[PDB]
From a paper:
This non-glycosomal enzyme catalyses the last step of the glycolysis (the irreversible conversion of phosphoenolpyruvate (PEP) to pyruvate; Figure 1A). Like most PYKs, trypanosomatid PYKs are homotetramers. By using a combination of enzyme kinetics assays, circular dichroism (CD) spectroscopy and macromolecular X-ray crystallography (MX), we demonstrate that sdAb42 (one of the sdAbs raised against TcoPYK) is a potent inhibitor that impairs enzyme function by selectively binding and stabilizing the enzyme’s inactive T state.
Second, we were also able to crystallise the sdAb42:TcoPYK complex in the presence of sulfate, which acts as a phosphate mimic that can bind both the active and effector sites of trypanosomatid PYKs. Despite the presence of these sulfates, TcoPYK clearly remains in a T state conformation when bound by sdAb42. When taken together, the data strongly indicate that sdAb42 impairs TcoPYK activity by selectively binding and stabilising the enzyme’s inactive T state.
Author numbering:
A (entry chain G): 1 to 130
B (entry chain A): 2 to 500
The structure:
Amino acid sequence: QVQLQESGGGLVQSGGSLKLSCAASGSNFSSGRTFSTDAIGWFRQAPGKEREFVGGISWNGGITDYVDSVKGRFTISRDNAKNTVYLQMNSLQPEDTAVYYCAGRDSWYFSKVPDEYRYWGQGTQVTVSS
Amino acid sequence: SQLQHNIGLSIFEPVAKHRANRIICTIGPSTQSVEALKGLMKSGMSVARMNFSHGSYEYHQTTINNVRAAAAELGLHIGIALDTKGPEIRTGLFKDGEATYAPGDTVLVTTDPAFEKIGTKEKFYVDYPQLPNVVRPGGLIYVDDGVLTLRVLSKEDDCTLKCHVNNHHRLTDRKGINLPGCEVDLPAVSEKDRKDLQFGVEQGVDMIFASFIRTADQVREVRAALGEKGKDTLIISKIENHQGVQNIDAIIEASDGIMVARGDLGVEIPAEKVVVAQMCIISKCNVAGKPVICATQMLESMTTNPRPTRAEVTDVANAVFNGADCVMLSGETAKGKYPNEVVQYMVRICIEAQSATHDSVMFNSIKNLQKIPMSPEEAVCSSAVSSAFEVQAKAILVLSNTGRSARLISKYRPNCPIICATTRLLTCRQLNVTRSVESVYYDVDAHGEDNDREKRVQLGVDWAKTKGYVSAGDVMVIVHADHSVKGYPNQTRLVRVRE
C-alpha cells in the first residue's frame, strides 16, 4: 500500500558517517493510513544473519528507541511533510557493516520484531572498512 | 458488555476491522477537479455533496460530470447528493465581502434589490420581502446564528427599517437570519428550491438532502416536487431546528434518511441538549432501520490546520458510537487545505470506533425491540446477522435490486461486510449511505439473466474474496429471494468458500 524507497548506502571509513534516507509513497486507502500515520523502524541484516532491530520512531516522532550498540552513534528522525525517514550513523565501525532496511508498521507505535511491520524498502548495503 | 470490551482494548494492538461507516464529502473550490475527486474517492469518499446554497447550475454541472468521470476512472459507484438552499432569510454579497458593526450603530435594513450586493455598514439587504410587515419596532433580528442582534427602531421607509446594533460583529457575505418570532410561515421549498430540484432529477442525482425540514408534510412536499421522473431518489430530511427534533418520529417515517445538522440545531437549543438530541435522533433512526448522518462541525479546524483537535475527534467518534451510519465533511473538503488528509482522518476515526464497540450489543438491542410474531422479511434479515454471528461468518451477501434488503440486514448491525449484489446502478450509488454495505453491479444486458441467481452469487463471492473479506474455508451468508415470492428476499443460504 505504502511503499518505502531506500537510498544512501555505500562504503565508508572506520570512524566515518553516513545518512540513510527512506522515502515513502502511496497509502493504505483501506485504513486511511499513510507514511505520516505510521511508525517506522530501521533494521539491519549482517552477513549470514537474520534481520535485527536498530532503532524506531513513533508516528509523529515523539518517541524513539535504539539498540544499545548504536546508541550515541545513530539517530532516527523523520520529516512527515517530506515523507522521509532518516538514519544518521556516526562513528561507523566495521561491526556496522550490514544491509539496512526501513520498515513501516500500520501502528502509531514502533516495534523491534521484524514480523510486526507491514511494508519494507529493498534495503541498502553499508560497508565500513578501516 | 461494552464494559468488558473497554477493559479489553489495547492502544498498541493494530485494529482489524473493515470500515463499516460511510463518509460524505462536500465538493467545492479545492476538490472539484477530477484529479482531486479521485483523491477524495481513493481516500474514502462514498457520496459527493452538491451544496446548492451556493454556485450556479454550471458550477454544479461541473461537479456532476467530474465525479462521474473520476468515479468511472476508478470504477466506483459514488453517490451524488443535492443539498438544497432551503428556506432561509439569507443576506450578504457585502461590498468588499464584509462589514463590521459596533454596538450603538444605526444601520438600514432594506428589501430593495438595488442594494442586494452593494451592502455596507450603513445599508444592506434582507431577502425576506415581508420583513417591515412582520418585524415591528422594538423586537430583535438575529443575524448570523443568534450572534449579531439588532433592535428595530422605526419602519423608516416602505420596505426599509432603521435598527439599533446590540453587539459588535463581523458579517461576511450571505449570513443567515433567525427572526425570533415565528409566524414567518416559511415555505418547505422556495421557488429556487423547486427549480434546483428538477435540475437534480434531470441530471440523475441519487439523493436530496432536503434542508430545514420541520414537519412530515414538508418531506411530502419535497417528494412531490421530485416528480415521477424522480420517484426513486432518496430524500434525506435535514433536522436543524427544534421543530424537526419535535416531530422527529413522523419525519423519520416519511423520509428515507435523517441528517443531524448539529450546528444549526445549536442556534436554538443548548449544546448539552444538542448532545442528547443526537443520541435520540440517531437511535430512533437505528430502530427504524433508516440511514442517519452527522453533519455540521465534524473535524472543523482541519479546514486550515493539518490536524484537528482531540475534542473534535472524540466528537466524530461519538457520532459513530452513537450509531451514525455516515459522517459528512463540508468545507473541510470543500474549501480546505487538506481534503484527502481530513477524509483519511475520518476513515481512521470510524475504524477505531468500530473496533472499539462490542460487536453484538446493537444487534441484541435492535433484536430485543422487535415485536413477535416478526414478519417473514424482518426475520429473514434478522436471522442472517444472527446466523453470521453464530457460525462466525466473514460476509453477508444479499441479492437485492432496490437495496431495501441491505438496509434491513444492516439494521441488525452485523460484524462483517454486507455485499449487496444489485442489478441497478442507482442502488449501488444510493446504498453508499448504509453501514457495512458494499454494492456489486450485475449488468444483465452484458451477461445472462441469472434466474438461477448463480452468477450473481459468484459475483458477490468473487468480490468478497478479491476485496480480502473471505478466504478458502470461510463461511459466508447468502440472502436472496426464492423464485416464488412477490418481491423481497425470503431465501437464505450458508455457504463455504471453495478454493
